[PDB]
Coordinates of C-alpha atoms and ligand atoms in Angstrom, one line a residue:
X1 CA 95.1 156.1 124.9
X2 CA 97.0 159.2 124.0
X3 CA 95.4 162.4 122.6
X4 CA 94.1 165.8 121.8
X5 CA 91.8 164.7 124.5
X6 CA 92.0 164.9 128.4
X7 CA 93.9 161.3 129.4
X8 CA 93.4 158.7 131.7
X9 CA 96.5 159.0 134.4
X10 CA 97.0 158.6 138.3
X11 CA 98.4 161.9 139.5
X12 CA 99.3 162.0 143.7
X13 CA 97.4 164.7 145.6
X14 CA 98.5 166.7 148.0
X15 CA 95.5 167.1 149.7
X16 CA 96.4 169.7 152.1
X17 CA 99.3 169.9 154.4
X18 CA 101.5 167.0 156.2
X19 CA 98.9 164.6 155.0
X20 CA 100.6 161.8 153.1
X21 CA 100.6 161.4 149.5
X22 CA 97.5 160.9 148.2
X23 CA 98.0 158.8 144.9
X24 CA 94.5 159.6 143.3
X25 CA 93.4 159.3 139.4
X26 CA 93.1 162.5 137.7
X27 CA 92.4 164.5 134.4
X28 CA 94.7 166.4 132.6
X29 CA 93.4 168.6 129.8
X30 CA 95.0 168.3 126.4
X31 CA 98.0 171.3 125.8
X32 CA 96.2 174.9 125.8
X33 CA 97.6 177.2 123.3
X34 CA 101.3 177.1 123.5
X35 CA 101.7 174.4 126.1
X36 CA 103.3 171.0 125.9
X37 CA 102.0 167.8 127.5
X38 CA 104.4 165.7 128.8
X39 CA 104.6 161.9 129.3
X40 CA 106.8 161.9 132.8
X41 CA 109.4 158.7 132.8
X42 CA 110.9 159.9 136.4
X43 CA 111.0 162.4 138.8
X44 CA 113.4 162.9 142.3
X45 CA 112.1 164.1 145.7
X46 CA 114.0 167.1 146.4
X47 CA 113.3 168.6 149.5
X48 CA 112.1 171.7 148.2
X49 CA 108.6 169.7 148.0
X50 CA 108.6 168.4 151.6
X51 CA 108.1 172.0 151.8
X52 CA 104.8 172.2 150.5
X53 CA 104.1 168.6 152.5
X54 CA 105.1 171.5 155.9
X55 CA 103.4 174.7 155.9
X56 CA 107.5 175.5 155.4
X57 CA 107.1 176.6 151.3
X58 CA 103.5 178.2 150.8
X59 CA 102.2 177.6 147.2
X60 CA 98.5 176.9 147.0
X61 CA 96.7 173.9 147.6
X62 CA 95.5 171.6 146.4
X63 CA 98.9 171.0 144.1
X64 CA 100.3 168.4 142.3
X65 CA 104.3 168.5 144.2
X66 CA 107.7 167.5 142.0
X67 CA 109.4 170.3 140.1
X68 CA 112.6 167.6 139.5
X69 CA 112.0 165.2 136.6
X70 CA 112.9 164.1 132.8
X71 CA 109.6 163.4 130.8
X72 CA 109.4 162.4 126.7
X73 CA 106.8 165.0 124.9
X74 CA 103.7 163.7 123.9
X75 CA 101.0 166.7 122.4
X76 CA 101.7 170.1 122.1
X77 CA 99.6 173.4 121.4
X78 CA 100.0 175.6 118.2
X79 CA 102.7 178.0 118.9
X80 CA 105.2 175.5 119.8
X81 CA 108.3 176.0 117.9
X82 CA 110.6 174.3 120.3
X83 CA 109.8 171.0 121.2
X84 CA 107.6 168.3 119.1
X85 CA 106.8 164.8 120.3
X86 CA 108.7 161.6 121.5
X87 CA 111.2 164.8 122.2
X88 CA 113.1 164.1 125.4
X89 CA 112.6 166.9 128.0
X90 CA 113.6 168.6 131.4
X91 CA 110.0 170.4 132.6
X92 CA 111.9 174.2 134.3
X93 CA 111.5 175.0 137.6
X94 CA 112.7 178.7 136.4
X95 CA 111.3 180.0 133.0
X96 CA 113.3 181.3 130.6
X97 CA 110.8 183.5 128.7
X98 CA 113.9 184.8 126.2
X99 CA 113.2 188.5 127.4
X100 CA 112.5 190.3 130.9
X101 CA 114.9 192.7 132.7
X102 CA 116.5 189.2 134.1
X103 CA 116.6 187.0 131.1
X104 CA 117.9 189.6 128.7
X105 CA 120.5 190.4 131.5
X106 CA 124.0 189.3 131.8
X107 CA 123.3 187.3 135.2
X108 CA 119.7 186.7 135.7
X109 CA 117.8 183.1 135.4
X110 CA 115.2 183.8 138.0
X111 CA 113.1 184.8 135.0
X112 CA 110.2 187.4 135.7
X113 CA 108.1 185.1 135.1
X114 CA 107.7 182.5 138.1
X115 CA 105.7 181.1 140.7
X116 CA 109.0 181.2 143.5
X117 CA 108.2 184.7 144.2
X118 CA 104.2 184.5 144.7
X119 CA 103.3 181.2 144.5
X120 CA 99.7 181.6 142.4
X121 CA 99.1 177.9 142.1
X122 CA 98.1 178.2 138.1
X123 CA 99.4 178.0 134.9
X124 CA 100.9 181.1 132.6
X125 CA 97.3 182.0 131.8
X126 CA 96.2 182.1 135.6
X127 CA 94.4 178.6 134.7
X128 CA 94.3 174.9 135.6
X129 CA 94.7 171.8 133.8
X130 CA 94.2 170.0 136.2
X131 CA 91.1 167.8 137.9
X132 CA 90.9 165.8 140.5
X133 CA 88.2 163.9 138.7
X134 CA 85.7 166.7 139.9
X135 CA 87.9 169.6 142.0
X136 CA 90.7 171.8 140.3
X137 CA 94.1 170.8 141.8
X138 CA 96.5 173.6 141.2
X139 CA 100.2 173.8 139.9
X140 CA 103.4 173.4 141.4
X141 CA 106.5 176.1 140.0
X142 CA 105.3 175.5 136.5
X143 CA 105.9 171.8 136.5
X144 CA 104.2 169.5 138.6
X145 CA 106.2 166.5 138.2
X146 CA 104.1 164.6 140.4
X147 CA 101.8 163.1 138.1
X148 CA 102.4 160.9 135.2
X149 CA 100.9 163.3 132.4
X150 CA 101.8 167.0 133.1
X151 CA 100.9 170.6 131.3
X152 CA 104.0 172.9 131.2
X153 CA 104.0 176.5 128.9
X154 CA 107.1 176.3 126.9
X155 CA 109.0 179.2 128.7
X156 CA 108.8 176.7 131.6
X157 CA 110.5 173.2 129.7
X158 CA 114.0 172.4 127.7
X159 CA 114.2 169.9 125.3
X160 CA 117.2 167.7 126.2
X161 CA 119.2 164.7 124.3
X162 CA 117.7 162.4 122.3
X163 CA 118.9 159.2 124.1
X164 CA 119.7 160.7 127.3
X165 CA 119.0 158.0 130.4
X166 CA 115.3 159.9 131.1
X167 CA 116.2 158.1 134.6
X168 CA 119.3 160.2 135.2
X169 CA 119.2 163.3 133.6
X170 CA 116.4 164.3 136.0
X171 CA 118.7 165.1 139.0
X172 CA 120.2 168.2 136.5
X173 CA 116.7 169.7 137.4
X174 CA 117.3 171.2 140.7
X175 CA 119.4 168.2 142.9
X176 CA 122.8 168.7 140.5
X177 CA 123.0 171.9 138.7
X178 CA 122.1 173.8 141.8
X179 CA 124.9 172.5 143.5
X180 CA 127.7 171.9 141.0
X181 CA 126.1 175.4 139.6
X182 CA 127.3 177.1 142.5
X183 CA 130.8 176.1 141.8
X184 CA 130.5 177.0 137.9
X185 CA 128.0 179.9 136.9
X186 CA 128.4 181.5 140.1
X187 CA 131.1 181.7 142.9
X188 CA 133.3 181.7 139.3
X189 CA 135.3 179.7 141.2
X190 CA 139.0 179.9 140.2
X191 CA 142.2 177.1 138.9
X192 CA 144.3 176.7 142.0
X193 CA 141.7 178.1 144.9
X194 CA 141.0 176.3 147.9
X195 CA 137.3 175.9 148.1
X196 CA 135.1 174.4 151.4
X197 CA 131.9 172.7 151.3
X198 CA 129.2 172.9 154.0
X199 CA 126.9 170.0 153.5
X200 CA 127.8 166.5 152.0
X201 CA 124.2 165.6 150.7
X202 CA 123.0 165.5 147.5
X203 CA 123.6 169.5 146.5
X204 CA 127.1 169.7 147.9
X205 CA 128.8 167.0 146.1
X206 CA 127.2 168.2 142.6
X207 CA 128.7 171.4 144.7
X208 CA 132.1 170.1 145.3
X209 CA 131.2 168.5 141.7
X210 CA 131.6 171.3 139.7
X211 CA 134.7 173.2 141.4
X212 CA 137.0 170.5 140.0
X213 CA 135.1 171.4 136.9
X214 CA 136.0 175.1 138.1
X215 CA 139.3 174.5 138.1
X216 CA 140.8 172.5 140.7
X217 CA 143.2 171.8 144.0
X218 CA 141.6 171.4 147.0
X219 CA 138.5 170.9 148.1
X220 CA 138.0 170.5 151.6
X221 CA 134.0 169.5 152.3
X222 CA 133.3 169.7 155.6
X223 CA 130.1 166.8 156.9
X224 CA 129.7 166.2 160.9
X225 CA 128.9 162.6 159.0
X226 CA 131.3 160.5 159.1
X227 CA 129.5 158.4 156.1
X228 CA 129.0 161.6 153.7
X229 CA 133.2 161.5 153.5
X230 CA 133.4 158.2 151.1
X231 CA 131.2 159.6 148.3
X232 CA 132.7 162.9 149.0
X233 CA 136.1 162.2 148.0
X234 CA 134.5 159.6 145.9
X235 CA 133.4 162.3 143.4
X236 CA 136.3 165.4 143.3
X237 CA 136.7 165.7 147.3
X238 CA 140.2 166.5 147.8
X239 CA 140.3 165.9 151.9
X240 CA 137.1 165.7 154.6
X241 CA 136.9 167.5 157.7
X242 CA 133.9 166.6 160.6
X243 CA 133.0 169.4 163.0
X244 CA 133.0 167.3 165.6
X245 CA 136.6 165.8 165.7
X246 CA 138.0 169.5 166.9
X247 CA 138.1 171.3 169.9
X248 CA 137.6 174.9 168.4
X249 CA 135.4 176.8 165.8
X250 CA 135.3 174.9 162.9
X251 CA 135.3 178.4 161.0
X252 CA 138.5 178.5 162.6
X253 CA 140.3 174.9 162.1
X254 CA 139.7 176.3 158.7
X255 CA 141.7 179.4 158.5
X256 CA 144.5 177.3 159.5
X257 CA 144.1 174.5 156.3
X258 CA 143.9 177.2 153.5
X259 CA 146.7 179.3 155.8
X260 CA 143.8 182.3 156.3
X261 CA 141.3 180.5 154.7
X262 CA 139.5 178.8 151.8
X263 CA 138.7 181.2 148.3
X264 CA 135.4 179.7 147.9
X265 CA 132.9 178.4 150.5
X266 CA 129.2 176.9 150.3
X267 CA 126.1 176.1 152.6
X268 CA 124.8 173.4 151.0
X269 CA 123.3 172.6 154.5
X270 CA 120.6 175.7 154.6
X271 CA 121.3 176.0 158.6
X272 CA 120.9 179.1 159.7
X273 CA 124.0 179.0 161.6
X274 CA 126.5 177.7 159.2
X275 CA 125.7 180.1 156.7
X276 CA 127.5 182.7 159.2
X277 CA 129.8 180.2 159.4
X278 CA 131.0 179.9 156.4
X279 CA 131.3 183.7 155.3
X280 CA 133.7 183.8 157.9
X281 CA 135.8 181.0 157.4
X282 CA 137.0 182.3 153.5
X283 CA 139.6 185.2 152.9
X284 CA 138.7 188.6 153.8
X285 CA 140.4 190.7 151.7
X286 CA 139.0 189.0 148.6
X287 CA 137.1 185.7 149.8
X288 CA 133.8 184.5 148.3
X289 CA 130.8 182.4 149.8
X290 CA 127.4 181.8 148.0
X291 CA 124.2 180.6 149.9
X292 CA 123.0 177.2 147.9
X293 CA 119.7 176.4 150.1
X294 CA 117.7 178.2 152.3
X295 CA 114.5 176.9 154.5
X296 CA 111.4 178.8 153.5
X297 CA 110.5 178.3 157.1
X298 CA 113.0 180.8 158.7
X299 CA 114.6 183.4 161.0
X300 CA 117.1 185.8 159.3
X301 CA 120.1 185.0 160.6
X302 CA 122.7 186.6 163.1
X303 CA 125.6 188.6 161.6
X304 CA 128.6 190.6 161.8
X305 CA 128.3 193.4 159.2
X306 CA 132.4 193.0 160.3
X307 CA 132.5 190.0 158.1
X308 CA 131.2 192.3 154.7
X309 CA 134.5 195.2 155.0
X310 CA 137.3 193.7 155.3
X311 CA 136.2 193.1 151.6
X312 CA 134.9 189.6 151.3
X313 CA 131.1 188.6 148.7
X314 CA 128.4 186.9 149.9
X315 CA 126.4 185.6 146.9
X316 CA 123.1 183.5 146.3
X317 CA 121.8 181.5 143.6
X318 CA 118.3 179.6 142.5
X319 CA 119.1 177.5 139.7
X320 CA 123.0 177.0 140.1
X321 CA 123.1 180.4 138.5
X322 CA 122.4 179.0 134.9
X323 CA 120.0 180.4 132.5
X324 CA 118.0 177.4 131.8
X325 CA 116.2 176.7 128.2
X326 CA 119.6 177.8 127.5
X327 CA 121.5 175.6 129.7
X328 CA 119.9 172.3 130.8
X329 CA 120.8 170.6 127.2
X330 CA 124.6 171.9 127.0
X331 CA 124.3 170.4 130.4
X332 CA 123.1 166.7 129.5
X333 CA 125.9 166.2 126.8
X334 CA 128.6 167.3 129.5
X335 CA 126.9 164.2 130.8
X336 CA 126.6 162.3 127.5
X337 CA 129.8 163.9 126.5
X338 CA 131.5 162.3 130.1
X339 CA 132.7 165.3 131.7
X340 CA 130.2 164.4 134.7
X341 CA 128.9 161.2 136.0
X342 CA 125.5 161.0 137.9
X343 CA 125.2 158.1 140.1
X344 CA 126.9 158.4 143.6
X345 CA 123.8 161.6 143.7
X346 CA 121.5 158.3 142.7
X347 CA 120.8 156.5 146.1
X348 CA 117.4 154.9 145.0
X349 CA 115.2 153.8 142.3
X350 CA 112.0 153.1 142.8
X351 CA 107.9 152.2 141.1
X352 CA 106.4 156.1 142.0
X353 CA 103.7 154.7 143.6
X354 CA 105.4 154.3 146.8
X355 CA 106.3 158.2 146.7
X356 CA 105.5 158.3 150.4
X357 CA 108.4 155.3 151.7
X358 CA 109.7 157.3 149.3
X359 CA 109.3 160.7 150.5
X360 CA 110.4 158.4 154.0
X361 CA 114.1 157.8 152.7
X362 CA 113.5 161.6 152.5
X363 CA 112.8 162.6 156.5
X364 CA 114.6 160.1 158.4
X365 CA 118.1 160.7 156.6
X366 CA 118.9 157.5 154.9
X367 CA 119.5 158.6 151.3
X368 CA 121.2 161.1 149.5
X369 CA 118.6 161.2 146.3
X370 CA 115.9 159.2 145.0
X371 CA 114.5 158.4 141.6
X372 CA 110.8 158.0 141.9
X373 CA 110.6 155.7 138.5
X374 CA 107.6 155.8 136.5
Ligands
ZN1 ZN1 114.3 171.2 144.2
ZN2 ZN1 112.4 186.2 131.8

């Protein structure tokens, strides 16, 4: 089977908070009026789901988790301009609905128009296509990656390259153009600069991946992990620094490096306590530091108002900045064009069904990003 007519598919449930994955059998409707079903391929366990898995993230349950994944087309509704079958695609996280305050504006992607804000559980229309066999389940952002059939509006999904690697070009969904994003659409990061990195995971080096794209020279990256360092310099890493191998603020053996500090710094860590730490150790005259991630489960943070005069920007970016039916696709080439490569992000590939050793790898440290194949 394949349709015009609800389908046969194995969705995983998320039956209700820190409860395993609950890899059910469910029934998708056929594309509504201007929606696009989607055949997923693969999807990545970002963390931002292990926040719906914790209490950490609220968005409704039921819900069907994943927001990172590259799917091939496979119905769509009348309306649908944009995308038509055996299409490669990139479901969006962050709409892209061509026209609200943000999305006509110069520097807004966080489109009027998503679920980040008030999560609603639903679909565009306030609806769900989803049932778990008997009980709605409801969505996840606008994608719900989690399933292997999925029902996305169009606002919410970007068609991408033809014979792009539907295996790789998943991670530029949140994992890799949130972090190198930073670095290019946002913290405009400069040729010459000195630029640190707080975090060695997944999101800092597509972080520290996109500064060399920036422009260049050094790029300290800062990991207490002595293991995050290979990788590191392995993709653009110009020198790595541990927090632990000093006897004095790190924000300080810092300072020293960039002679008064690094242009550029990121969190790519989401601690509450390095992201102070890291406004601080950049110029402040002139020095810029952007927020990457940022636990939903959180106290504000402790801070020197000191740090803002002497001149210095604090940023933030969802999305790495990027407007994104715009931007995923000129995105893919860089990839199928070279500039890029993805693997070192791609620490394992595995059948979806064991999302939960899966969503393991995840919690107990182990691996930088994961391919959930389907
Ligand atoms: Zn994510
Ligand atoms: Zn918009």
């Amino acid at each position: 089977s394949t349709a015009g007519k609800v389908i046969k598919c194995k969705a995983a449930v998320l039956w209700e908070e820190k409860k395993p994955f609950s890899i059910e059998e469910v029934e998708v409707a056929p594309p509504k009026a201007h929606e696009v079903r989607i055949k997923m391929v693969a999807t990545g366990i970002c963390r931002s789901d292990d926040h719906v898995v914790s209490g950490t993230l609220v968005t409704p349950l039921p819900v069907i988790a994943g927001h990172e994944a590259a799917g091939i087309v496979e119905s769509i509704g009348e309306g649908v301009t944009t995308v038509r079958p055996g299409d490669k695609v990139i479901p969006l996280f962050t709409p892209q609905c061509g026209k609200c305050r943000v999305c006509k504006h110069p520097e807004g992607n966080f489109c009027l128009k998503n679920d980040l804000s008030m999560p609603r559980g639903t679909m565009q229309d306030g609806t769900s296509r989803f049932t778990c066999r008997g009980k709605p389940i409801h969505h996840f952002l606008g994608t719900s990656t989690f399933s292997q059939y999925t029902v996305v509006d169009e606002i919410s999904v970007a068609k991408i390259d033809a014979a792009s690697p539907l295996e790789k070009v998943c991670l530029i969904g949140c994992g890799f153009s949130t972090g190198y994003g930073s670095a290019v659409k946002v913290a405009k990061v400069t040729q010459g600069s000195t630029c640190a990195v707080f975090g060695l995971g997944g999101v800092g080096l597509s972080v520290i991946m996109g500064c060399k794209a920036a422009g260049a020279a050094r790029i300290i990256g800062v990991d207490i992990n002595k293991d995050k360092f290979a990788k590191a310099k392995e993709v653009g890493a110009t020198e790595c620094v541990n927090p632990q191998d000093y006897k004095k603020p790190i924000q300080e053996v810092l300072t020293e490096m960039s002679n008064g500090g690094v242009d550029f710094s990121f969190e790519v860590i989401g601690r509450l306590d390095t992201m102070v730490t890291a406004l601080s150790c950049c110029q402040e005259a002139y020095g810029v530091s952007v927020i990457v991630g940022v636990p939903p489960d959180s106290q504000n943070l402790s801070m020197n108002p000191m740090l803002l005069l002497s001149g210095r920007t604090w940023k933030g970016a969802i999305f790495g900045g990027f407007k994104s039916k715009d931007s995923v696709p000129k995105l893919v080439a860089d990839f199928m064009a070279k500039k890029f490569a993805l693997d070192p992000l791609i620490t394992h590939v595995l059948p979806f069904e064991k999302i939960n050793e899966g969503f393991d790898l995840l919690r107990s440290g182990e691996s930088i990003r994961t391919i959930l194949t389907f």
